[PDB]
Ligand binder design. Structure first.
Ligand SMILES: O=C1CC[C@H](N2Cc3cc(C4CCN(Cc5ccccc5)CC4)ccc3C2=O)C(=O)N1
Ligand SMILES: [Zn+2]
Ligand SMILES: [Zn+2]
Ligand SMILES: [Zn+2]
Lengths: 801, 57, 372
């Protein structure tokens, strides 16, 4: 296999945000974290001045600014997910802008158990040292050589640097087998060992989750849980328990004023709160500000403006008015930034019938759930909010409408029924219906329902492809989870139908004993229920298989035919020793895979009306999505933000092993893939597979010849010498296949981003690289490489996205 | 009647030697539907019947 | 001491060690050959490790994998004039057959490649939001018998740890079928039906050793035990064990396969040792014997005897299959009246399989036998 992967759309999810004086001690900068991308914005009176966007050879996990001893401006600390660290300084050289790596290094240790609470990176206020918590019972310290110190507390929740102490001192919240408590520890570099912390509180709330150290005028640390918000400063102890917080746990924050009198707090659901200090300190007081997108990170800007960093929905710029608004909120949204992530499904449509192809995604979650329309002609973005969770999508041209699996949250009232949290598309439908089935009404059992908590109800929405208006909503049964969706014609019937696979989920029954496949037809603004077919398991996936419907039921793969009675006739069956979750087809071949990378490849034999096992390969690892490249090669995604391709085993001199699959492709993408689909966004490369991520990243993968692969390999190795590498991180190390304990160099995949960067280097760099390369234009004439030949080849390669 | 012929596998007590040997042979197996006339063992009990009927005649 | 992964190693092979070993399972062994001692009399200085094999068709000697064993006890004498030599061995790293050298006398050496133990992190490490890493840890577990008997507590658990699973194509309760803690609980709910020993301390928290402790208590086939060893993923190993404990319940004669002996409901743990354990007879034959309350379709052989009884206070009587007369085990009958079960049965596993009940319902005949 010889493949090429390139970024088509940079990530849109916001995983971090900080403000500081980076471009100059007087300038005010805004820093945005977008997975592999880092953005620098300057705070203006009207808004934010965009300055620079860069790409890193690492997944940004920690990002904090600091002002070093006797230095011009704030310096930046960054740690990658692969544990590469780098320190950056903003450099202007006339018209050229550069980010220099003042120091770099990797802080990995071969042996270490990563803590449950993840990576944490903090810097002391004096900017003397950097604290890192990567593995339990160890604490790395950098004053880029580093040293570890032992920790008897093996379950750290959160830790921060104290203000106003004789030496840098840390205070943390741990959970021991006797409760949850807070503690302190002092640092001695000269000793490279721990000293005694100034104080200690032997008990704290069982759900303590956030620790914030208040600056020097106050000192101490703020502790926040579900029920209690406490303050501790040696022997000073304060505590409050406001009601407005029990609905959602406090998750993200930011310091408002440098004197430390006001804090911002956001919940898991988009409510934004402010912490006010009534000053010694007398008491604490909390106030609701309003509702925002679910916030991953928050930053107080200035002029009553706060930046909303969101992973689930669009980022927002909001104003903080001294008076509340008529709905009760003090916040109003000023400007929104497009966010494509998370992407749970997508489809490609040539809406204008121009041979183009437009990308339409089911994106977001909860009230930020939305459809995203992507148009190339660079990429154009239209946003259509849905206010509930989208799941799956398919396109039906004859009806000029989309089918979308949707789910909304409701809470149990006290009136017997349930109430929605907010208006959504499923309650704004022009027409509505709820299916009724005696077959599943035949389920009679105990079902003690508590009355005051959440529950999921799934719905099917039908929406016009032009206006994107809610045409029709069909509600699914109680305890029924909408899983699979497909639109296609069957048998001799020329009508086009929507087929939906469902399952019944009950809280005390793990393995699903029940499920449905329901066929729908959309006519004159109404969805007519066609048929009902009960199966004894969950209907995970369905795929059009040449006039027939291939369906997955738990670990069973069943092929259904279309009867003349407009029903499904079970033709044949194939039982697998794994749960048949992922299902992709091409022609008569059938590839089946589970969640744990267990691959299973079948081929339907029409002469006997059944399936034959062609090959099989098990390699235990979490798998997120899988796709077929061609008859002999298949692409998958497996944890570790990693991609893999396995071969159909060409010419194995082993009859019993021609059914075994090798491993010819491995690649570290840096993104978590959820769905693959064939298509291209335009009118030497073969094939085309687009994929969407949780961070909204979009790339294109196509196949190459051995000559094309071999040529680009030496070019990449050459470019790695000349391209200025962020943090001096090697591309071979970045793209290395990496599990939490293993590492192996990638092969079979060309990093199209790095290839395209060739056009943006100075012309002297190009000639330097091309020199001493043996060139083959194809079939005829092997010579030395021409500086030009690559460029015009490179452009025709760029003309894929 | 004191059964001094014990089987090392299961422990069965037998009153005569030759009865114990008949026991330890059944411990082994090899499709244990042995026909006593010919010794042809069969994999199932119904195929023994169809095989047994060829044995009387 | 343990060998590094994938290493090309040469290990002795012990003849007449006919079983399939699962790592950590202890093995007492009766020796009689001087060659068995001749291997041990040197092995004990000092490796103390050989290679238990996994024969599929031992009469044709078909084996493909196995489990290294670490001889951890060895001390013996010639008391009452009979020279007696017994050792306790324990299994360690799984392996795969490559080449084999039957040396001069027996001395079958094993050219072997170590099998790597494949550890996998949680399902959330990729998609879990950095903001909620503080929320990952729960306010611990109540370790009780009331909110575990109730499921409301665990629902909130399943709700929280996979809250960010809403960013995938798959909902939470699916990952519950891959959550080690959930799968352990599903087993932490089945063996209290079987055993009264405290799960809490006796079981290990780590699923690796916990998977092998489940594997050394299930009366399953020799072949089922085999592909159970092919499974590097402790998670897959648990689901396979689980779906076995769901389907594979009622046990039949391995040889005739026409006689339903007993059901898994009839299993019970007599002592803290467990329901199934390895017992030895006075001739060196090792029996993985299971204890069950009731069994049927068996004939008894001979009179009961207390001689060398593994359960003092009970007299055993040989039991064999009604149809094929192959040995199934023993009927243990109490000697006194103050004995608790009075008639606890007791079957040897190598003749058993808790087979799929081919339900004789004319409306529910066959079904699906996905051996996962
Ligand atoms: O509960 C259980 C199940 C049965 C299992 N046994 C017991 C057992 C005893 C013997 C023979 C050993 C030789 N003596 C000779 C002798 C005669 C009278 C007095 C003393 C010695 C007779 C018994 C052979 C096989 C087995 C066997 O498989 C076990 O150990 N426990
Ligand atoms: Zn016997
Ligand atoms: Zn015969
Ligand atoms: Zn039998």
């Amino acid at each position: 296999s010889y493949n090429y992967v390139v970024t088509a759309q940079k990530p849109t999810a916001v995983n971090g945000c900080v403000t500081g004086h980076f471009t100059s001690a007087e300038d005010l900068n805004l820093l945005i974290a977008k997975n592999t991308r880092l953005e620098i914005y300057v705070v203006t009176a009207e808004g934010l001045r965009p300055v620079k966007e860069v790409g890193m050879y690492g997944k940004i996990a920690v990002m904090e600014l600091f002002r070093p001893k006797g230095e011009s401006k704030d310096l930046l600390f960054i740690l990658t997910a692969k544990y590469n660290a780098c320190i950056l300084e903003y450099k202007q050289s006339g018209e050229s802008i550069d980010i220099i790596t003042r120091a770099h290094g990797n802080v990995q240790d071969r042996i270490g158990r990563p803590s449950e609470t993840g990576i944490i990176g903090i810097i002391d206020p004096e900017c003397r040292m950097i604290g890192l918590r990567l593995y339990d019972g160890l604490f790395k310290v950098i004053p880029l050589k580093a040293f570890n110190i032992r920790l008897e507390e093996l379950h750290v929740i959160d830790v921060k640097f104290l203000y106003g102490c004789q030496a840098p001192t840390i205070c943390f919240v741990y959970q021991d087998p006797q409760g949850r408590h807070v503690k302190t520890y002092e640092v001695s570099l000269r000793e490279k060992e721990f000293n005694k912390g100034p104080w200690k509180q032997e008990n704290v709330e069982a759900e303590a989750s956030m620790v914030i150290a208040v600056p020097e005028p106050f000192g101490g640390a703020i502790i926040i849980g579900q029920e209690s918000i406490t303050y501790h400063n040696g022997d000073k102890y304060l505590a409050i328990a406001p009601p407005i917080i029990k609905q959602s746990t406090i998750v993200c924050h930011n310091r408002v004023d440098p004197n430390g009198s006001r804090y911002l707090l956001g919940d898991m659901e988009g409510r934004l709160f402010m912490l006010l200090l009534e000053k010694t300190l007398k008491d604490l007081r909390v106030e609701l500000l309003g509702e925002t997108s679910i916030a991953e990170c928050l930053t107080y800007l200035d002029n009553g403006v706060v930046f909303v960093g969101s992973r689930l929905g669009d980022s927002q710029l909001v104003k903080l008015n001294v008076d509340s608004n008529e709905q009760g909120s003090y916040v109003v949204a000023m400007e929104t930034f497009t966010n494509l992530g998370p992407i749970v499904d997508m489809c490609v449509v040539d809406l204008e019938r121009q041979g183009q192809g437009q990308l339409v995604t089911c994106s977001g979650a909860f009230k930020e759930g939305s459809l995203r329309i992507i148009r190339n002609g660079k990429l154009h973005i239209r946003t259509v909010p849905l206010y509930e969770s989208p799941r799956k999508i398919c396109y039906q041209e004859v009806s000029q409408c989309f089918g979308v699996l949707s789910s909304r949250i409701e809470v149990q009232d006290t009136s017997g029924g349930t109430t929605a949290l907010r208006p959504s598309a499923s309650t704004q439908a022009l027409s509505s219906s709820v299916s009724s089935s005696k077959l599943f009404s035949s389920s009679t059992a105990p079902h003690e329902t508590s009355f005051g908590e959440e529950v999921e109800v799934h719905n099917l929405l039908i929406i016009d492809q032009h206006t994107f208006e809610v045409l029709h909503a069909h509600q699914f049964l109680q305890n029924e989870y909408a899983l699979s969706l497909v639109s296609c014609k069957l048998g001799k019937d020329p009508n086009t139908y929507f087929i939906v696979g469902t399952a019944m989920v009950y809280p005390e029954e793990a393995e699903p004993k029940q499920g449905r496949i329901v066929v729908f037809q959309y006519s004159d603004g109404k969805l007519q229920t066609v048929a009902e077919k009960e199966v004894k398991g969950a209907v995970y996936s369905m795929v059009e298989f040449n006039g027939k419907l291939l369906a997955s039921i738990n670990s069973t793969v069943r092929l259904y035919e279309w009867t003349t009675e407009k029903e499904l006739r079970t033709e044949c069956n194939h039982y697998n020793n794994i749960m048949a979750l992922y299902l992709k087809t091409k022609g008569d071949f059938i590839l089946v895979g589970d969640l744990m990378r267990s691959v299973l490849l079948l081929a339907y034999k029409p002469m006997e009306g059944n399936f034959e096992e062609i090959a099989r390969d098990f390699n235990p690892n979490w798998m997120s999505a899988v796709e077929i490249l061609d008859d002999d090669n298949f692409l998958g995604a497996e944890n570790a933000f990693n991609l893999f391709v396995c071969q159909k085993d060409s010419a194995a001199t082993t009859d019993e092993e021609r059914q075994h699959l090798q491993e010819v492709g491995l690649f570290h993408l840096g993104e978590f893939v959820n769905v693959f689909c064939h298509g291209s966004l335009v009118m030497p490369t073969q094939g085309s597979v687009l994929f969407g991520t949780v961070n909204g990243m979009i790339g294109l993968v196509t196949s190459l010849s051995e000559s094309w692969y071999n040529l680009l390999l030496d070019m990449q190795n050459r470019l790695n010498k000349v391209i200025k590498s962020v943090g001096k991180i090697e591309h071979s190390f970045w793209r290395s296949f990496h599990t939490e304990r293993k590492t192996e160099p990638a092969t079979g995949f060309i990093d199209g981003d790095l290839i395209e960067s060739f056009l943006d280097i100075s012309r002297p760099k190009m000639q330097e690289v091309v020199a001493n390369l043996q060139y083959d234009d194809g079939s005829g004439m092997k010579r030395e490489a021409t500086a030009d030949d690559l460029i015009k080849v490179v452009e025709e390669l760029t003309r894929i996205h | 009647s004191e059964r001094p012929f014990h089987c090392n596998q299961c422990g069965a007590s037998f009153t005569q030697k030759g009865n114990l040997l008949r026991h330890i042979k059944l411990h082994s197996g090899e499709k244990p539907f042995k026909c006593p006339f010919c010794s042809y063992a069969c994999r199932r009990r119904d195929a023994l019947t169809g095989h047994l009927r060829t044995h009387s005649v | 001491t343990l060998h590094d992964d994938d290493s090309c190693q040469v290990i002795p092979v012990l003849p007449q060690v006919m079983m399939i070993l699962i790592p950590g399972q202890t093995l007492p062994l009766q020796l009689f050959h001087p060659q068995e001692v001749s291997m041990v009399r040197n092995l004990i200085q000092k490796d103390r490790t050989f290679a238990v094999l996994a024969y599929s068709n031992v009469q044709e000697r078909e084996a493909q994998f196995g489990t290294t064993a670490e001889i951890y006890a060895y001390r013996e004498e010639q008391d009452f004039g009979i020279e007696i030599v017994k050792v306790k061995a324990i299994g360690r790293q799984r392996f795969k057959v490559l080449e084999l050298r039957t040396q001069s006398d027996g001395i079958q050496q094993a050219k072997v490649q170590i099998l790597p133990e494949c550890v996998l992190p949680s399902t959330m490490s990729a998609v879990q939001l950095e903001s909620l890493n503080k929320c990952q840890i729960f306010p611990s577990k109540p370790v009780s018998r009331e909110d575990q008997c109730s499921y409301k507590w665990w629902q909130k658990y399943q709700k929280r740890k996979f809250h960010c699973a809403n960013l995938t194509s798959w909902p939470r309760w699916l990952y519950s079928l891959y959550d080690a803690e959930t799968l352990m609980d599903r087993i932490k709910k089945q063996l209290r039906e079987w055993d009264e020993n405290l799960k809490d301390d006796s079981l290990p928290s780590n699923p690796i050793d916990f998977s092998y402790r489940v594997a050394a208590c299930l009366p399953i086939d020799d072949v089922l035990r085999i592909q159970l060893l092919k499974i590097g993923s402790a998670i897959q190993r648990l689901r396979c064990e689980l779906d076995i404990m769901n389907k594979c319940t009622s046990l039949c004669c391995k040889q005739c396969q026409e006689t339903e002996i007993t059901t898994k409901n009839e299993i019970f743990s007599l002592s803290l040792c467990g329901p199934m354990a390895a017992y030895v007879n006075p001739h060196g034959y090792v029996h993985e014997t299971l204890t069950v309350y009731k069994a049927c379709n068996l004939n008894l052989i001979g009179r009961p005897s207390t001689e060398h009884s593994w359960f003092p206070g009970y007299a055993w009587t040989v039991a064999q299959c009604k149809i094929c007369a192959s040995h199934i085990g023993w009927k243990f009958t109490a000697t006194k009246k103050d004995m608790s079960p009075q008639k606890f049965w007791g079957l040897t596993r190598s003749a058993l399989l808790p087979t799929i009940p081919d339900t004789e319902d004319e409306i529910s005949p066959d079904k699906v036998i996905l051996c996962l």
